[model samples]
Target: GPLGSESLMPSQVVKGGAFDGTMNGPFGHGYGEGAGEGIDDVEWVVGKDKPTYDEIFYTLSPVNGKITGANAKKEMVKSKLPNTVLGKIWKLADVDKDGLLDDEEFALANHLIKVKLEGHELPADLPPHLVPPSKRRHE
Candidate 1:
């Protein structure tokens, strides 16, 4: 048998794995629409379970409509959080930076203390949303 004088070569373009179907489905309809609305709900719920923060604010005896740092510290320290932590909470809750807490500021401070006592980490800076409505102007 005559030797076959032929050569065979195979080549493949192999080009379809481009499954680059970057279809990125339109992200699910924003499920978080109610987040902002519930903040007021938090205040309402807190109010219902106990005396209003306003009541507590007055019991602390704010002179000239403000609670001096010393007086506020006495109550805040009762939370048992470290003095350093309480100090930071005071700074953030003071709102006007006057070193005294007004009615709204006092309530805010207590709210923050409650949050800490309940085991939530305090914000390095208070979130504007958490500022009391009356004191939000200062924030």
Candidate 2:
């Protein structure tokens, strides 16, 4: 009678452990869903108000309608983000492949900085919706 009872106890313990592993999968999926919402929230911060960005851009003192890397660096550094992160933002915001930033580009740079400061990762490439209106293709 004691030997038969021991066999049933092992099977019950194994079943309980398997159930716990299965529950873990659902929690992982929930975190992914939250990540999707995080991206949307950052986009909203940049998209919800265009004029606010323009005002900030003008204050950066663009010369020849474009902000030099030096001028942008001054404002960008104030975010307290590391140079590596700021460097990546520069590459993405300068969509025209130019080293300088126009009014629209400056606004884009600030938007990206805000995104990063808000604890979101900069995309590997800028998304279509986030592209400044003037920078988008005419087609």
Candidate 3:
């Protein structure tokens, strides 16, 4: 039952500029179209064991380290299980109904999803939109 987020340690902020030399946040601003856009602070989530930062990334950011509500929906739809359980999984995963799944929520939700996926085999090459970019339930 260890589940929670929003406990970011003080970031080891860095200070730097780019070719343009515009002041950016401590992360040394970059050029990725989506760089730093969705990178919420490295908030800690309570789990049985403290997960490495990489663990957190794969956990929350199921696809390319960017988890979104639509992804959550696909995670739910793919269950192929009855709505009764899938509904509960969705409810638990999106605890805040904010349509965003953070590390804590995603981890718990995935565990639940795994339970429903027991013995089910997923096909290879699920549609790009349907396939999770990374990470999966272990039911």
Which predicted model would earn the best lDDT? 2
Q: Indicate the residue-level lDDT of 98 in model 1.
A: 79
Candidate 1 deviates by what RMSD?
Answer: 10.2
TM-score of each prediction: 0.59, 0.60, 0.37
Please provide, for model 1 over 1-139, each residue's C-alpha lDDT reduced to its tens digit, 9 standing for 90 to 100. Answer: 2357544336644458665555786776656565454444434233442345567778877789777877788878887878788888888777667777777777777877887878786876766557666655531
Task: Give the TM-score comparing model 1 with the true structure, all chains together.
Answer: 0.59
* lDDT, residue 77, model 2: 80
Give each model's whole-structure lDDT.
0.70, 0.72, 0.51
Q: State in Å the error of residue 66, model 3.
A: 6.5
**C-alpha RMSD values across all candidates:** 10.2, 8.4, 22.4
lDDT digits (tens) for residues 3-122 of candidate 3? 576654488545566345667776755575844654544332334422542375364456543467676666667756666666666665554556756555566556556645676432
lDDT of 3 at 125: 23
For model 1, the local distance difference test gives 0.70
- Per-residue alpha-carbon lDDT of candidate 2 for residues 1-139, written as tens digits (9 for 90 to 100): 7765654554455455554545454443334343344343334345666566667777777788778768777777887778788788888887875777777777788888888878986876777667876765533
The collision pairs in model 2 are none
